[PDB]
Amino acid sequence: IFFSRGVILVEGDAERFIVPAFAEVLNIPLDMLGITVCSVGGTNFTPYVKLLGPEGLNIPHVILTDRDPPLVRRRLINVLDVIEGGVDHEELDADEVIKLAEQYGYFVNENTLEPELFAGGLAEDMQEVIREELPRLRRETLNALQQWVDDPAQIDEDLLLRLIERIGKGRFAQALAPSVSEDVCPAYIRSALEHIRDAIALEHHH
Ligand SMILES: [Mg+2]
Numbered sequence: 001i002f003f004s005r006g007v008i009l010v011e012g013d014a015e016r017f018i019v020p021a022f023a024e025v026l027n028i029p030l031d032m033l034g035i036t037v038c039s040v041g042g043t044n045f046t047p048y049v050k051l052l053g054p055e056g057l058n059i060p061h062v063i064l065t066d067r068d069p070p071l072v073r074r075r076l077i078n079v080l081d082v083i084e085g086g087v088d089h090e091e092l093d094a095d096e097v098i099k100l101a102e103q104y105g106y107f108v109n110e111n112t113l114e115p116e117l118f119a120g121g122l123a124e125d126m127q128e129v130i131r132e133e134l135p136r137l138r139r140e141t142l143n144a145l146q147q148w149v150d151d152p153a154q155i156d157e158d159l160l161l162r163l164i165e166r167i168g169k170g171r172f173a174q175a176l177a178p179s180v181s182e183d184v185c186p187a188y189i190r191s192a193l194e195h196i197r198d199a200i201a202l203e204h205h206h
Contacts (some may be wrong), residue, residue: 003188003201005034008059009048012039012172014113015064019193022185023178030199035196043071047169049079060199062105062192066112070094076108077102084178105195107188112157114164117176119152127180133175 008030010016017041023030030037033180040048045063063079065072072096080089080097083104091098098108109116118126127149131137137145141159147153164172 001036002057002059003034004036004059005063006036006050006200007048007059008035008037008192008196009045009061009063009066010037010039013168014164014173015039016115017170017173017177018113018180018191019064021180022189023193025180026185026190026191026193027183033197033200035200043068043075044078045075046078046082051085055082060105060196061205062107062196063101064107064109064188064192067108067110069110071098072108076106079106080104092130102191105192105199107191107195109186109188112161113186114172115155115157115160117184118148118155118160120186121132121184122176122179123149123152125139126176128177129172129179130163130167133172134163168177 010019013045016037019037022031038048043065045065049061049063050056050201065075076097077089080087080101089100092100093165100110106175110206114126130145133144141163144156144159
C-alpha cells in the first residue's frame with residue numbers, strides 16, 4: 001500500500017483513524033495527496049525510517065509518538081542514527097534529541113492521545129461513544145465517566161484506557177472521528193500533518 005508520495009508513521013490503530021480525521025478538518029486531504037498513515041504496531045520506528053529514508057526508498061515521512069516518562073530519547077536516537085548518517089547523537093539530552101528530531105518531521109506528544117483528547121474538548125463525545133459501545137456499564141463506572149466529563153481532571157486515566165482498549169483502540173477511534181473538529185486538534189498532530197503536507201507541495205512546486 002506504498003505507491004505513496006508520503007507516509008505518516010503512527011504507533012497504533014487509534015492514530016491510524018484519528019489522524020486522518022484531523023487532516024480532513026484541517027483541509028489536508030491525505031488520500032488526495034497520496035499520503036498513507038502506517039501504524040508500526042508499537043514504538044519501534046527504526047525499520048520504517050530505514051525503509052523510507054535516504055538509503056531506502058527516500059520517501060517523505062513523519063513520525064508521531066508519545067514521550068513516555070523518557071523512552072522517547074532512545075527511540076529517537078535510533079531513527080536519527082538512520083536519517084542522519086554516521087553523525088553521533090549520544091551526547092545530546094532528551095530535549096536536545098526531541099528538538100533535533102523535529103527537523104525531520106518527528107513529533108513527540110507529551111502525555112497520551114486519548115486522555116489528551118478527553119481533557120482538551122472531546123470529553124462529551126467520548127463518553128457518548130463509550131456508552132454506545134459498552135451499553136451495560138456498571139453504574140459505578142458510568143458515574144466515574146460523568147465525573148470526568150464534568151471535570152477533565154477527575155479523570156481516571158487507566159480506567160479510560162481500559163474501556164477504550166476493551167472497545168478496541170481502532171474501533172473506538174473510528175467512532176470518534178465524526179466528532180473531531182479543527183480547534184481540538186493536538187499540536188503534535190497538526191505539526192506532523194503540516195510537515196508532510198509541506199514536503200509534498202514543495203515537490204510539486206519543484
Ligand atoms: Mg507510546
